[PDB]
Symmetry: D2
Subunit: 363 residues, 4 copies
């Protein structure tokens, strides 16, 4: 329900100083921004762990206005807003709108206190005693889950991998600690991230796990997912899917001009060797200086059914032949703009930037 | 179970270089060390999220020996060892003994790969229906076990929920302050004393915060003091001690036995006199560069805890102590006096951090020197001297 | 001089954005003027050179078809300054895209070990008989000169203690040992477009001395604006990102005026008169103008023990001292734990302090919403009752 | 001057808790330890900036013992021990012996205060004659103390500054800095011994080894041992690696062989360590093959072929301009399972649910 350009503008202004936050809250309706922040919060919350269901009241305040959201918190259900009559309110959490903007989407130092207000058992007589023993722990656990969603603490990619049912870590692959190392320093930037391959293939429901992972990892980011199949059902706040073929260089240049430039591009697509090579040539020019191009699953370089060759020395048309040529380049556009190559099992990271430093007179 | 002196020695040696790791494995029976590491791993694992129970085989290798442990992993149950046949084995995880020691108890950089070997569905003969049933569960179960085989910093706020301790989420909001002050100690072989194990007179309750410090400090030894017997809490790297925090003689005995402490935390009776007695007796047993923490100063204002409703009538309160520490930090700035001489606390405090219901005191040599004589002692004279 | 304050701040704001903001910037402003602004910043940012032999480092700032060339004369004991192309031996050519230099100096960015610039050693050296002797003469000087210039072209965190000895301030080394505390408390703000107000510019009555600490904060906060308040005139200290203000720190109405004009502040430092009344007046007047999550800093609380600054020799008679203030802030932090009273109303400070850090001669006060809630009435208010209510039988 | 085995033991013990620090100081003469710590300090000190020559007295206390060292600190001159009457004492710095051990060689958090005592102008008496010196020795005593206290800790240095001081580096910093609190063993092949001093400075708890064909025993100092021999003799390389290793880091300068030293020395890099190749067509070929080594578990199964040592032991490769970093570790994650299809269309069908 939120305009993408608007969300991007809110995130841009949130990263600013007091004048930008003020500009933000005058440019847009506060009620609308509050709804946007709650939608963000609900996606950021970890899974609840309390057995007894509780409500956490989230009050967002701007000037004279008070926007109240009653959140149902119980294990095995995602946190959702419900009516005030639908359960026991264990906690009231109050935020100033601009403070919540800073905590969610700002460029901020860590703030261990003073970001909000809290009032325990806010509407609590007869049962006064009995109510404590039933909801005390559940309210502690419910509140912790909501407050976790109200900030920008760095999550654990390996855990997100299990949570969003993506195979980046835990069975087939062990990519996430490499992703963490290469990606974590970008987290306060308003990144644009493009992943080739949303997941689920031709099945009408599956896919998007890795997109949800990047959204969670990059609190200020916009995530784009390209897939040959329609993935419109995956789209949500800060996640856009695009339908098209990674093997169409012209089309890639087109979407890169509309949505770029990209801080990060990830290839987890078809895994056809020619596709990997086409996508790189087409998209590497659209990676920002200081940005990254990632290729997953180079294993197909050894398999003819993906356009590979079993003989590792026959690498001329494979993803590994590309990586090998990137080594030559480091020591054409690509040649002039690569400063680093990181290779791990089934994943490689390419660092973009002018390869122009340390020049000497050849004589 | 496992002898405390031995556990501490293992951790000491595991923090060294190759020669220390070799000394370790030659000094102790490899089989015993493996059981120790598995006990540690069991407490270290996060709660699993897989609905279908799986086994993760952990194989620990040393020389020609191979120690096999089968861990049952399922949501809502603690991870536990079982026999080989007591489930479907979704993953084989293999460690060299010395590598697992480094990963659990070592002083080590982050290692994103190469610390172990993995074999998915290790005993599956090619198997179809088994994929549908177990792939996701194997992935999630392995993820939980592997988290327990490393030293990744946990979230104290989350641990508070998990271990049922009031440090964060309802009554209190301490954990982010603890994180800031404590996280830089995590690669040290810390000794942590908390006064107040929890549960009071209840026969089973308590120890949540001790379990929390154990998780946070992968190389630490945790001690918990309580007036009530808390022997049921004791586990690897956690010892409870029965005694009275208001008994200075006893505190000194246990400090000599188990100290010196890098960290002391008072979360005890919250009687103002007790807080002051414990601080005076235990502050000398805090290491230089260490911390003394006082929780729940709220009782300063409450007579039923020895406090006073008037914040100015603070001479016997925990806040009165904290206020006096400010003067202690500044003590070298007092005008010259041949009669007066600085006390132990004066000479040994270099920082005070006060937050709502929690305060951190930095132990260290307070000997920077006061403002020299030649700097004028009135405003006007200072202005004319600096021009 | 040429660089309007609102312009500098706008440049810094846009530099912190993504590609669309960097493009917006270079379209909003003349690329040549921006390039001049960046060079002015770079000259202030460079460390002292160590090379004995003077070299030229050519900094070329490229934007589209335009190439803005600056020849920087670099030598030990002299401030790096622009000279003519022919006024030395060019040891190194350093080349930046305009938008890339903007990101590096004023942006919010991850560490980039490579790929931010191009360099060419001895760019104009002709293959001659003199060339061999010229390489012997200039090789070391070229690398040392380049190091000094490259350090000024980035936002790498400086050592605070080093900046103390460089700009001649007593924050560390002899009288005081403040810098490691300042580093601990200030380093997490370095990404932000901070506004920092320091009361007490330095130099006192002397018409030349002072500004040392202000230059220290400018260097430490790459994206910041620094304000210095002093009763005396300090107009000579003013430079890019540093403004001085003339006035009394003990005049509350004036403080509220300047805070409304230049605030709100992420950080306020009191290093002024050290008069006990002045510290108290300033805190009450300026604390409301510290941003939530910001810091109020008090230096030199040693004068609290001395009548000549309105202090008292007896530490117990602290009602009017800076130490008395710090003591009361502990109660302010704890105020929600007070027994309820209909007539008592929590004050502004009560509601807005969330932390206090006290070190020898320096204290840091954390501004934020103090509204965690006090211990509920239904928690027993005596130890024996607590034991009973917590033992479940 | 100081026995190598002893230095390593001191460093090992200093990295422990209280019981190790006490064991250290009861195992060795405190006077000797003090002299070792001073030697270390002098090598860690940055170049002084003060024009006026001043003395900094470093006093090291252990029980009844008090070891007093007067250090002349002047611009354009290295800091050295002198007598008390060889200048003006502008500052007395005092450390507990165990505290100095921790600060220099310990595994410790950053401690912004309370690690020492300091007394400015510790011997200046009277008032009328004192004013004269205060004006001339104030600025110098601040700059002189700064330089000494800088050498008294384990703060990370700037490799770029070190590279000029001892007559590219940002990549070294990236990959090396996480090792700094470990008692590392670093071997550099190809040795003036400027770069060995750089690594000594960068790794405060480290032992550095430099191999060269020339005799470079004049480069040897605390925590730096040079080794003479042939780097093309693979047996020799294996021999010295067993003797002095295993190595957390090996640095191989290929410009002045690389395949030979890599094959011989890679097995002696610790798991989780680094093999570094600086600079040339034979170097590049090796780097490219290391990609296949990383990916070796993805090869189609072959009974006649079995993975080599390198295949099983490389887990990462980082290539930059003129330098590459190879990560040693167990490469045993498992290849893609047989039951995953080996052509695109079959893969699409098998993971589309219907
Ligand atoms: N030629 C092509 N162009 C674009 N997408 C393609 C393609 N061929 C296959 N794909 C898509 O690439 C996806 C590979 S699976 C991606 C997995 C996902 N990144 C995750 O981690 O969960 C499939 O969904 C498939 O539909
Ligand atoms: N005089 C005394 N000496 C030691 N412990 C005491 C004491 N009086 C009370 N206690 C103990 O202090 C504890 C307070 S509750 C401690 C809670 C625990 N730290 C947690 O965070 O979960 C109770 O277990 C009580 O038995
Ligand atoms: N009432 C008042 N209001 C504002 N400034 C005052 C003042 N009384 C004194 N000052 C100024 O405060 C300064 C104290 S010295 C400041 C030192 C400087 N902050 C540094 O660290 O380098 C003097 O320059 C003096 O002119
Ligand atoms: Mg993949
Ligand atoms: Mg408590
Ligand atoms: Mg001062």
């Amino acid at each position: 329900e939120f305009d993408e350009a608007t969300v991007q503008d809110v995130v841009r202004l949130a990263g600013g100083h007091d004048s930008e936050l003020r500009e933000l809250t005058q440019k847009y309706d506060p009620a609308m921004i509050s709804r946007l922040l709650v939608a963000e919060i609900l996606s950021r919350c970890p899974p609840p762990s309390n057995d007894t269901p509780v409500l956490v009241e989230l009050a967002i305040v701007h000037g004279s206005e008070r926007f109240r959201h009653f959140l149902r918190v119980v294990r095995d259900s995602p946190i959702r807003p419900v009516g005030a009559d639908e359960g026991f309110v264990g906690m009231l959490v109050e935020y100033e709108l601009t403070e919540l903007l800073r905590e969610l989407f700002g460029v901020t130092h860590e703030r261990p206190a003073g970001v909000r207000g809290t009032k325990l058992f806010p509407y609590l007589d007869e049962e006064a005693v009995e109510q404590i023993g039933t909801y005390l722990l559940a309210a502690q656990q419910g509140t912790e889950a909501v407050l976790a969603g109200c900030g920008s603490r760095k999550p654990d990619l390996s855990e997100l991998s299990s949570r969003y049912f993506t195979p980046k870590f835990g069975f087939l692959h062990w990519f996430t600690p490499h992703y963490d190392r290469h990606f974590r320093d970008y987290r306060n930037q308003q990144v644009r991230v493009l992943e080739i391959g949303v997941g689920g293939y031709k099945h009408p429901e599956w896919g998007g796990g890795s997109l949800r992972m990047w959204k969670s990892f990059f609190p200020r980011g916009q995530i784009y997912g390209l897939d040959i199949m329609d993935k419109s059902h995956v789209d949500e706040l800060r996640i856009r899917t695009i339908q098209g073929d990674q093997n169409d260089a012209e089309f890639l240049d087109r979407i890169a001009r509309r949505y770029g430039p990209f801080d990060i591009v990830i290839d987890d697509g078809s895994h056809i060797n020619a596709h990997v090579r086409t996508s790189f040539a087409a998209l590497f020019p659209h990676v920002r200086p200081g940005g990254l191009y990632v290729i997953e699953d180079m294993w197909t370089a050894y398999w003819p059914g993906f356009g590979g060759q079993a003989d590792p020395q026959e690498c001329s048309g494979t993803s590994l032949g590309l990586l090998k040529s990137l080594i030559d380049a480091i020591q054409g556009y690509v040649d002039r703009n690569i400063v680093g190559l990181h290779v791990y099992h089934n994943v490689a990271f390419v660092e973009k930037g002018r390869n122009d430093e340390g020049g000497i007179p050849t004589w």
